[PDB]
Write a protein that binds this ligand. Structure first.
Ligand SMILES: CCCCCCCCCCCCCCCCCC(=O)OCC(COC(=O)CCCCCCCCCCCCCCCCC)OC(=O)CCCCCCCCCCCCCCCCC
Ligand SMILES: CCCCCCCCCCCCCCCCCC(=O)OCC(COC(=O)CCCCCCCCCCCCCCCCC)OC(=O)CCCCCCCCCCCCCCCCC
Ligand code: HEA
Ligand code: HEA
Ligand SMILES: CCCCC/C=C\C/C=C\C/C=C\C/C=C\CCCC(=O)O[C@H](COC(=O)CCCCCCCCCCCCCCCCC)COP(=O)(O)OCCN
Ligand SMILES: CCCCCC/C=C\CCCCCCCCCC(=O)O[C@H](COC(=O)CCCCCCCCCCCCCCC)COP(=O)(O)OC[C@@H](O)CO
Ligand SMILES: CCCCCC/C=C\CCCCCCCCCC(=O)O[C@H](COC(=O)CCCCCCCCCCCCCCC)COP(=O)(O)OC[C@@H](O)CO
Ligand SMILES: CCCCCC/C=C\CCCCCCCCCC(=O)O[C@H](COC(=O)CCCCCCCCCCCCCCC)COP(=O)(O)OC[C@@H](O)CO
Ligand SMILES: CCCCCCCCCCO[C@@H]1O[C@H](CO)[C@@H](O[C@H]2O[C@H](CO)[C@@H](O)[C@H](O)[C@H]2O)[C@H](O)[C@H]1O
Ligand SMILES: CCCCCCCCCCO[C@@H]1O[C@H](CO)[C@@H](O[C@H]2O[C@H](CO)[C@@H](O)[C@H](O)[C@H]2O)[C@H](O)[C@H]1O
Ligand SMILES: C[C@H](CCC(=O)O)[C@H]1CC[C@H]2[C@@H]3[C@H](O)C[C@@H]4C[C@H](O)CC[C@]4(C)[C@H]3C[C@H](O)[C@]12C
Ligand SMILES: C[C@H](CCC(=O)O)[C@H]1CC[C@H]2[C@@H]3[C@H](O)C[C@@H]4C[C@H](O)CC[C@]4(C)[C@H]3C[C@H](O)[C@]12C
Ligand SMILES: C[C@H](CCC(=O)O)[C@H]1CC[C@H]2[C@@H]3[C@H](O)C[C@@H]4C[C@H](O)CC[C@]4(C)[C@H]3C[C@H](O)[C@]12C
Ligand SMILES: C[C@H](CCC(=O)O)[C@H]1CC[C@H]2[C@@H]3[C@H](O)C[C@@H]4C[C@H](O)CC[C@]4(C)[C@H]3C[C@H](O)[C@]12C
Ligand code: CUA
Ligand SMILES: [Cu+2]
Ligand SMILES: [Mg+2]
Ligand code: NA
Ligand SMILES: [Zn+2]
Lengths: 98, 84, 514, 227, 79, 259, 43, 46, 58
């Protein structure tokens, strides 16, 4: 009929491949494979930007089908606003290990 | 020619094995067979020194520079005629 | 820590730097070859005495500038430096393969230099048409070394093309569509696609010449029922995409320079700019036989090719007008980069329009293989391709180096170059119309005046080139580091500083979907 | 031939070259329009301190700068194509001459009646008689009857050459194994000069071509005299 | 007669610049005609037309080369 | 510590050695054609072989042993391989173009006909037919190989992959034998040039293809492939089908239409 | 694009030498070869 | 980790501006010179 | 055959600062060394040949 003998990914994937696979299954994206879903971006409900360090570049697509992304460094601290459209972004920690 | 058999609702490697052993390899066997009952050793073709054949603009970089790489003395003449 | 860095690199910036370095050097060779051409023609009679050496010079002039100067600077240098920074990628998709694309070029160049050392060199033209390039009218190793230079160059660009395309498609932020990438990126991708499809055909055609020269094939030799015209088709099927390969990344750089120095946050008509590059890309594959209007093709074929060639005017015009609309209402800063860009826009248009003249198979009978063609192509190349390099070079120099240039000097450089190239190439139109052939070491007496003025222009441009070397020295000598850069919000490549860390975007950018 | 300080085409000796002069004027008119329009617009964009840096809506104005170029190209293409088919068309030629490229000289053959044929070589510089043109003069010229349709067949016995005579509007590559046709009609007797127009190696610069157009009577007698 | 002759007229079979085949076909046609009339006892002058046309259009070294090969028995055309 | 899924590659000498091998192979072919000698050629082939082995080794290390081929990296590899095949299709196009240029408009030096006078073409119903069946049967077995792999079936994968390889070798040998038996040569005008260059370059791709399948076979023996992650196999399968298809086109064009 | 003060300013003195050296590297080698060029039609 | 920042991301040193001036003159000059020597070479040769 | 991939994983995931192309022990080092020597040898030798081929004789 058939028989087996071929390892699966659960058995034999290692390294970064294995981590991405394990994370995927807990619904997490530590290695930024998916696009984040925006919040409403107000002062009360800002977009939460994971970073491992104290700052991270945000590109903001202010309206759908804009051909030009607005780029800016986002720093740890107060929520900052897109220079172009004002939508709020606050930096956070969790992309981190122990 | 236009096919004619069927499968999909239950499939897999099984189906592809089935086609390997039941269709593909048998075709190779048949085609091999047709060849073994066919190649009637071609009468060495008459040598004519046609100017468009046996082209030698520069000697080859092996042997005596007048022999093609898979030269067959039986069927391939030099420009001056058959060797043997 | 030097071998591991500069010889074994897996880093887009350092590979970019190497490419610029290689290109810079090649440029000197090419420039020197052009002065030797104009020296021979600077007054009547003969200077070199041997005309096989003139033909060798002409031929090598073309190879060095196209394959060794323009392509590596624009695609190899700017391309590797900028593409990942513009899309937030941590490097190219195939870093190690990227390094091989570079390291293939010096061997490639060695083999071309060697072609001219041995026997009486390759005095073929850059077209390398048989039978002249065959093993009778060009017996010996010269042409074979040329063929092999091109094989290697070719492989370099194909592997490069795969990397650029893969990188640009697969490694953007997951929320970024292709229609949110800058124009320079668009320009590299499309160029990469034309490389992918056009070079293989060149590789076939020169492989066929190679076997004609050394394995007794008769692809191009009528003795065996060959046709030397089959070579032209195969060459030019590549050759035409190649001219558009030479200018497209140029188009992308001008788009960014015009936009930056006008204070616009984006260029005018982004989607039209994208459309036009694709249309030029696509039409570039069905026009090749306009380099063959004198070889005896059917009249109906010549009518098709005239017509099809003309249509490229339409999307090219959309670009020219969109750059101009980009200047509209700009807070215009007169940086040297912007001066380079503005000169590009005018001078390109002029070379473009003489292209339109040539596209007429009627008129090309009398213009083919005359200095009118030389003029066309030195306008679009020497003042189109080169001006975008210059302009790009000045504009992004602070990003690569971390130091600023002296703008006053850079403007002086522009002014001299501008007078040189125009003085050199403008009179060649008259030569062509009056009937001076190309690929001549000497000319009837009547052509003396325009040839004299032209060669004088060379030297003006030489002075320009000498000064540029000095300008770059001064920058590094004086060490004015970069303080602030404006317009970083729409020019991501500046946003990690000058120069940026060895590894940029280790943590990628954050881009919401909505 | 070309005179010193020349800016444009040599004067037209054939009606087909005459056609091209006017077609070039027509076309160059259009080149001057577009190149001048661009320079003006450039200088227009650059000479004001007024600004509009917010985004501009595009597709409306792009119609113009797509449709209008298209009309201009039809105005070039139509006459261009009328001439091309005129150059090609049915000839009723009264005589056929061949020319054969060689490194580095031309040979000629008139074989309608008798096997008349000769080489033709650039008179070198040292041997030039006084008033004779450096690089353009040949020992034997191509004598042909003026005011008559002639068939030229061009080919070559070695590498590629090309047989050009600018003032008649002629250029046809010379390819070995291939017999390329062009037609030739001189409105005037005279001497008319061209030079080889494909790179054939070392002496590419030095294989000129010289027609000698004279009436039928003198051509006949010249043909009889050459055998 | 329908003959007395200036040069080869326009032949609709070969209307383009490339006239290679007009030379070839007329050379072939002539020798095919000469063969069949030399063999069968009928005036060879019926073949003159093709001779004039090919003499006019063919380079001398082409005619010369093909004539050698016919005599050598290596002329690649079927006469 | 990166927080993206792409692969930052350890600095590596192979690009420099590859580049230098290309200098030696090319310089070598030139010495060989002119100043009769195969010394450079040989060093070059050796350095090339040495470079390829070690480069591809490091890729297997990077992926199977080190875990660097994340789904993002795999996606890039698929694109790169498809683009390579397109390049190869365009290379072959040139040789076809050559064939058709010559055969549609046979010149007078050939007798004004195709095949040219004095050429005795092979029968397309004898060994060329066989060769076609052999590569086609090949496509069927490599496909069974792939489904077996995906269903977890080691013994059948290897079984099918072995059959595929054997067929590749059978083709090579039949074509080699045909080269020997052919009554025309590469030197026999344009007919011979197009025949042997086009088929020859194809022959070379058969060997590269097979070599690549041999690599997959041993890698399968050693358990490198999983039922989901096996891109080396997929690439080898695509390359193999590409090789099949070019044959179909040579068969229809050169052997059948051109006899 | 605002810079910092030159960390090692290059005086007009320095520049004059820079420009001179740089022009001389281009011009001498070429000039040598070109001067001696009627001497090369011999061997 | 490798050297970072201005003057540190290049395969030549800019720490001394006259060693730089010389390096730059050899480099660009050798490039500019090569064609003249190739021509000389060819003129002599035979 | 036996499935020894987990072991090769450990060996090549070892925190020892060696690049991928030497991380298998000294065999790698011998092949690196051989390949480079051959390349540089052959390259120099190939320049030597450009040498002779440039001249009939100065
Ligand atoms: C274009 C690049 C700009 C930089 C230029 C720097 C160099 C300076 C160039 C001086 C400043 C540039 C303007 C001069 C244009 C000359 C056109 C011409 O003589 O035309 C005559 C024709 C036809 O020839 C004939 O049928 C004979 C002419 C019969 C008339 C009487 C002749 C009397 C003799 C006159 C002698 C004096 C002229 C000598 C002229 C000597 C010049 C060296 O020649 C031709 O085919 C020439 C074809 C070339 C076409 C290239 C397109 C470039 C367009 C540039 C933009 C222009 C828009 C304005 C915009 C204007 C602003 C620039
Ligand atoms: C010579 C100088 C040596 C350098 C030593 C450094 C010392 C410190 C290390 C201190 C660290 C310790 C280690 C010391 C060892 C130094 C080794 C070395 O000298 O390393 C050498 C490196 C570096 O390259 C150089 O040699 C530097 C050139 C001069 C620099 C110019 C400045 C930049 C100009 C502006 C460019 C625009 C882009 C700039 C902006 C780019 C953004 C930053 O080589 C390369 O990796 C790439 C070069 C590629 C280009 C060559 C063309 C080849 C053509 C072949 C055919 C010839 C046939 C002739 C045939 C002839 C026929 C007759
Ligand atoms: C990119 C392509 C390119 C470039 C830049 C040039 C540049 C020049 N060319 Fe050339 N040329 C060709 C491509 C090019 N050419 C081709 C394809 C042919 C046809 C060959 C054939 O017929 O087979 C040809 C032929 C040709 C002829 C006709 C030869 C003949 O018919 O006999 C002439 C005549 O004057 C000429 C002159 C010049 C001059 C004076 C320059 C320059 O001197 C003008 C000044 C420009 C520069 C000096 C370059 C400046 C740039 C740099 C130095 C790079 C700087 C680097 C960085 C900033 C990183 N070239
Ligand atoms: C960057 C290099 C480059 C570019 C971009 C071009 C662009 C064009 N070229 Fe050219 N060309 C060369 C490099 C280039 N070329 C080289 C190197 C050769 C010589 C090969 C050799 O023989 O060695 C050559 C030769 C060449 C020939 C062969 C002629 C002969 O040898 O007899 C022809 C024929 O048509 C041609 C036409 C064109 C056309 C129609 C364009 C078009 O793409 C131009 C489009 C641009 C415009 C038209 C101006 C901008 C448009 C507008 C402002 C809109 C309005 C315009 C109108 C309404 C007309 N060029
Ligand atoms: C086990 C056999 C299976 C099938 C064939 C497999 C491989 C063939 C060998 C090499 C393949 C490589 C390149 C193809 C190049 C040229 C075509 C050679 C094809 C061939 O093998 O043709 C044969 C030999 O060719 C000859 O003479 C000359 C043959 C030797 C030529 C040496 C190599 C020449 C190098 C040129 C190519 C290098 C450049 C490649 C460009 C790539 C750029 C990316 C023809 O034999 P023949 O004796 O004329 O006739 C048979 C008479 N009975
Ligand atoms: C005859 C005389 C002239 C000879 C000229 C030949 C020139 C050079 C020969 C020397 C080259 C041999 C070694 C090349 C090895 C290919 C490397 C490769 O396989 O490239 C791969 C990417 O390209 C991919 O998939 C796509 C796969 C591309 C592989 C193609 C490699 C050979 C290409 C040469 C032939 C091109 C011809 C095409 C036109 C006909 C791997 O990418 P890396 O960036 O390395 O690593 C990425 C890491 O994430 C891996 O974990
Ligand atoms: C002139 C005569 C000289 C000719 C010399 C050439 C001779 C022989 C060449 C033989 C080709 C061997 C190719 C072997 C590549 C092996 C590496 C490999 O297959 O690497 C794979 C990645 O893909 C990858 O780079 C894929 C990389 C594939 C590239 C293959 C293309 C090779 C084609 C060469 C072209 C030469 C053409 C020249 C003529 C035009 C590894 O990923 P996986 O498989 O998913 O493993 C991971 C799982 O284990 C984890 O769970
Ligand atoms: C005997 C008399 C002959 C005289 C004829 C000279 C004619 C023409 C030469 C043209 C020289 C003009 C060059 C102008 C360039 C500098 C202008 C400028 O704008 O730069 C100035 C600095 O240069 C400075 O000292 C000034 C630099 C000037 C140095 C000039 C050296 C040129 C010498 C030429 C020699 C030719 C020899 C040829 C022999 C083969 C001012 O800038 P900064 O205050 O530093 O900036 C502030 C901030 O930005 C810093 O972050
Ligand atoms: C190519 C082998 C294929 C096997 C198939 C059989 C068909 C017959 C081909 C014979 O090929 C031989 O190969 C030699 C290779 O050693 C060549 O040596 C040539 O190259 C050497 C390079 O070192 C020189 O030393 C020699 O002088 C020079 O004859 C030699 O000419 C040639 O007879
Ligand atoms: C791209 C083209 C560039 C054009 C050249 C640039 C302008 C010339 C720069 C100076 O070059 C020098 O010129 C001298 C000529 O005055 C040569 O001297 C030669 O002649 C002199 C006698 O007048 C003697 O001083 C020397 O010994 C003798 O070598 C000398 O070799 C050469 O370096
Ligand atoms: C030039 C090219 C190659 C011929 C060759 O290799 O000899 C040939 C092959 C097919 C030809 C085309 C096709 O015949 C279809 C078209 C026929 C029209 O009368 C001219 C345009 C037309 C689009 C042709 C132009 C040109 O003659 C083509 C493209
Ligand atoms: C529809 C498309 C993209 C719009 C988008 O998704 O943003 C746009 C971008 C470029 C456009 C084209 C260019 O603007 C050029 C042409 C301009 C004319 O106004 C219409 C046709 C024309 C050929 C355009 C058709 C269409 O509107 C295109 C193709
Ligand atoms: C040895 C291995 C099983 C080992 C394992 O389970 O790890 C088996 C499985 C499939 C076998 C191969 C396949 O069955 C295909 C071939 C079958 C022939 O009958 C013998 C050789 C042949 C090429 C076999 C060699 C070897 O015995 C293989 C590779
Ligand atoms: C690390 C370095 C690589 C340098 C490079 O590739 O440019 C080493 C590795 C192996 C070295 C080579 C090998 O040790 C063998 C060669 C013989 C002697 O050991 C010295 C020179 C010799 C020719 C070495 C040159 C150089 O030091 C190499 C090539
Ligand atoms: Cu004959 Cu140029
Ligand atoms: Cu073109
Ligand atoms: Mg030509
Ligand atoms: Na001269
Ligand atoms: Zn926003």
């Amino acid at each position: 009929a058939s028989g087996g003998g071929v390892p699966t990914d659960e058995e034999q994937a290692t390294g970064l491949e294995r981590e991405v696979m394990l994370a995927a299954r807990k619904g997490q994206d530590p290695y930024n494979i998916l696009a984040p879903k925006a919040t409403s971006g107000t002062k009360e409900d800002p977009n939460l930007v994971p970073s491992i360090t104290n700052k991270r570049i945000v590109g903001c697509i202010c309206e759908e089908d804009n051909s030009t992304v607005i780029w800016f460094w986002l720093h740890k601290g107060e929520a900052q606003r897109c220079p172009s459209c004002g939508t709020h972004y606050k930096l956070v920690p969790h992309q981190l290990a122990h | 020619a236009s096919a004619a058999k069927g499968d999909h609702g239950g499939t897999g490697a099984r189906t592809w094995r089935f086609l390997t052993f039941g269709l593909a390899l048998p075709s190779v066997a048949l085609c091999t067979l047709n060849s073994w009952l066919h190649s009637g050793h071609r009468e060495r073709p008459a040598f004519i020194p046609y100017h468009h054949l046996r082209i030698r603009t520069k000697p080859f970089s092996w042997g005596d520079g007048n022999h093609t790489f898979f030269h067959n003395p039986r069927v391939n003449p030099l420009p001056t005629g058959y060797e043997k | 820590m030097f071998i591991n860095r500069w010889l074994f690199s897996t880093n887009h910036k350092d590979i970019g730097t190497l490419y610029l370095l290689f290109g810079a050097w090649a440029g000197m060779v090419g420039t020197a070859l052009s002065l030797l051409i104009r020296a021979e023609l600077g007054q009547p009679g003969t200077l070199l005495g041997d005309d096989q050496i003139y033909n060798v010079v002409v031929t090598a002039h073309a190879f060095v500038m196209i394959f060794f100067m323009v392509m590596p600077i624009m695609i190899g240098g700017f391309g590797n430096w900028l593409v990942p920074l513009m899309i937030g990628a941590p490097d190219m998709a195939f870093p190690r393969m990227n390094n091989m694309s570079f390291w293939l070029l010096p061997p490639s160049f060695l083999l071309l230099l060697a072609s001219s050392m041995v026997e009486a060199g390759a005095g073929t033209g850059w077209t390398v048409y048989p039978p002249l390039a065959g093993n009778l009218a060009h017996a010996g190793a010269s042409v074979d070394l040329t063929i092999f230079s091109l094989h290697l160059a070719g492989v370099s660009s194909i592997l490069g093309a795969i990397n650029f395309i893969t990188t640009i498609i697969n490694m953007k932020p997951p929320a970024m569509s292709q229609y949110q990438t800058p124009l320079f990126v668009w320009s590299v991708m499309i160029t990469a696609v034309l490389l992918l499809l056009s070079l293989p055909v060149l590789a076939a055609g020169i492989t066929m010449l190679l076997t004609d020269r050394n394995l007794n094939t008769t692809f191009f030799d009528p003795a065996g029922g060959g046709d030397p015209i089959l070579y032209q088709h195969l060459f030019w099927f590549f050759g035409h995409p190649e001219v558009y390969i030479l200018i497209l990344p140029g188009f992308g750089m001008i788009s960014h320079i015009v936009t930056y120095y006008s204070g616009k946050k984006e260029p005018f008509g982004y989607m039209g700019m994208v459309w036009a590059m694709m249309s030029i890309g696509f039409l570039g594959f069905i026009v090749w036989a306009h380099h063959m209007f004198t070889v005896g093709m059917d009249v109906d074929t010549r009518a098709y090719f005239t017509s099809a060639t003309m249509i490229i005017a339409i999307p090219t015009g959309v670009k020219v007008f969109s750059w101009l609309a980009t200047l509209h209402g700009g807070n215009i800063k007169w940086s040297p980069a912007m001066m380079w860009a503005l000169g590009f826009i005018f001078l390109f248009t002029v070379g473009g329009l003489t292209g339109i003249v040539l596209a007429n198979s009627s008129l090309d009978i009398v213009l083919h293989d005359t200095y009118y063609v030389v003029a066309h192509f030195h306008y679009v190349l020497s003042m189109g391709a080169v001006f975008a390099i210059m302009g790009g070079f000045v504009h992004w120099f602070p990003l690569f180096s971390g130091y600023t240039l002296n703008d006053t000097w850079a403007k002086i450089h522009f002014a001299i170059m501008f007078v040189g190239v125009n003085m050199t190439f403008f009179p060649q139109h008259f030569l062509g119309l009056s009937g001076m052939p190309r690929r001549y070491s000497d000319y009837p007496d009547a052509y003396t005046m325009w040839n004299t003025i032209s060669s004088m222009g060379s030297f003006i441009s030489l002075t320009a080139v000498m000064l540029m070397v000095f300008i770059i020295w001064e920058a590094f000598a004086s060490k004015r580091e970069v303080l602030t850069v404006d317009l970083t919000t729409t020019n991501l490549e500046w946003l990690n500083g000058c120069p940026p860390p060895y590894h940029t975007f280790e943590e990628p950018t954050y881009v919401n979907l909505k | 031939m070309a005179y010193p300080m020349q800016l444009g085409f040599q004067d037209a000796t054939s009606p087909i070259m005459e056609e091209l002069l006017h077609f070039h004027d027509h076309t160059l008119m259009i080149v001057f329009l577009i190149s001048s329009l661009v320079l003006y617009i450039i200088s227009l964009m650059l000479t004001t301190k007024l600004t509009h840096t917010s985004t501009m809506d595009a597709q409306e104005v792009e119609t113009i700068w797509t449709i209008l170029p298209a009309i201009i190209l039809i105005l070039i293409a139509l006459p261009s194509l009328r001439i091309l088919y005129m150059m090609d068309e049915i000839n009723n030629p009264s005589l056929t001459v061949k020319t054969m490229g060689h490194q580095w000289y031309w040979s000629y053959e008139y074989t309608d009646y008798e096997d008349l044929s000769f080489d033709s070589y650039m008179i070198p510089t040292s041997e030039l008689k006084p008033g004779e043109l450096r690089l353009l003069e040949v020992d034997n010229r191509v004598v042909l009857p003026m005011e008559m349709t002639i068939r030229m067949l061009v080919s070559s016995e070695d590498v590629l050459h090309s047989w050009a005579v600018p003032s008649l509007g002629l250029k046809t590559d010379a390819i070995p194994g291939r017999l390329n046709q062009t037609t030739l009609m001189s409105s005037r007797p005279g001497l008319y000069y061209g030079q080889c127009s494909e790179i054939c190696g070392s002496n590419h610069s030095f294989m000129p071509i010289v027609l000698e157009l004279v009436p039928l009577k003198y051509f006949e007698k010249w043909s009889a005299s050459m055998l | 007669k329908i003959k007395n002759y200036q040069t080869a007229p326009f032949d609709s079979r070969f209307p383009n610049q490339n006239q290679t085949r007009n030379c070839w076909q007329n050379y072939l046609d002539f020798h095919r005609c000469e063969k069949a009339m030399t063999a069968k006892g009928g005036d060879v002058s019926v073949c003159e037309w093709y001779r004039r046309v090919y003499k006019s259009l063919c380079p001398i070294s082409w005619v010369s080369t093909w004539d050698d090969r016919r005599a050598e028995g290596t002329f690649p055309g079927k006469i | 510590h990166q927080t993206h899924a792409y692969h930052m590659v350890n600095p590596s000498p192979w690009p420099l050695t590859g580049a230098l091998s290309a200098l030696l192979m090319t310089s070598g072919l030139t010495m060989w054609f002119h100043f009769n000698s195969m010394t450079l050629l040989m060093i070059g082939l050796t350095t090339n072989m040495l470079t390829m082995y070690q480069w591809w080794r490091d890729v297997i290390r990077e992926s199977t042993f080190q875990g660097h081929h994340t789904p993002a990296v795999q996606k890039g590899l698929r694109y790169g391989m498809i683009l390579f095949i397109i390049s190869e299709v365009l290379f072959f196009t040139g040789f076809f173009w050559a064939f058709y240029h010559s055969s549609l408009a046979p010149t007078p030096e050939l007798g004004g006909c195709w095949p040219p006078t004095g050429i005795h073409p092979l029968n397309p119903l004898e060994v060329p037919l066989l060769n076609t069946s052999v590569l086609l049967a090949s496509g069927v077995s490599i496909t069974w190989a792939h489904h077996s792999l995906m269903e977890g079936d080691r013994k059948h994968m290897l079984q099918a992959l072995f059959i595929t390889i054997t067929l590749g070798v059978y083709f090579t040998l039949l074509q080699a034998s045909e080269y020997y038996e052919a009554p025309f040569t590469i030197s026999d005008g344009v007919y011979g040039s197009t025949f042997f260059v086009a088929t020859g370059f194809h022959g070379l791709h058969v060997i590269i293809g097979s070599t690549f399948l041999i690599v997959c076979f041993f890698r399968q023996l050693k358990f490198h492939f999983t039922s989901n992650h096996h891109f080396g196999f997929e690439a080898a399968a695509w390359y193999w089908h590409f090789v099949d298809v070019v044959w179909l086109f040579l068969y229809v064009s050169i052997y059948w239409w051109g006899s | 694009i605002t810079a910092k003060p030159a960390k090692t300013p290059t005086s007009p003195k320095e520049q004059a030498i820079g420009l001179s050296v740089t022009f001389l590297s281009f011009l001498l080698p070429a000039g040598w070869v070109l001067y001696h060029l009627d001497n090369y039609k011999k061997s | 980790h490798y050297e970072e920042g201005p003057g540190k991301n290049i395969p030549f040193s800019v720490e001394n501006k006259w060693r730089l001036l010389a390096m730059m003159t050899l480099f660009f000059g050798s490039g500019f010179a090569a064609p003249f020597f190739i021509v000389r070479h060819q003129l002599l040769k035979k | 055959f036996e499935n020894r991939v987990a072991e090769k994983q450990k060996l090549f995931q070892e925190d020892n600062g060696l690049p991928v192309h030497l991380k298998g022990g000294a065999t790698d080092n011998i092949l690196y060394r051989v390949t480079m020597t051959l390349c540089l040898g052959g390259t120099l030798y190939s320049l030597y040949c450009l040498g002779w081929a440039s001249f009939p004789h100065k």
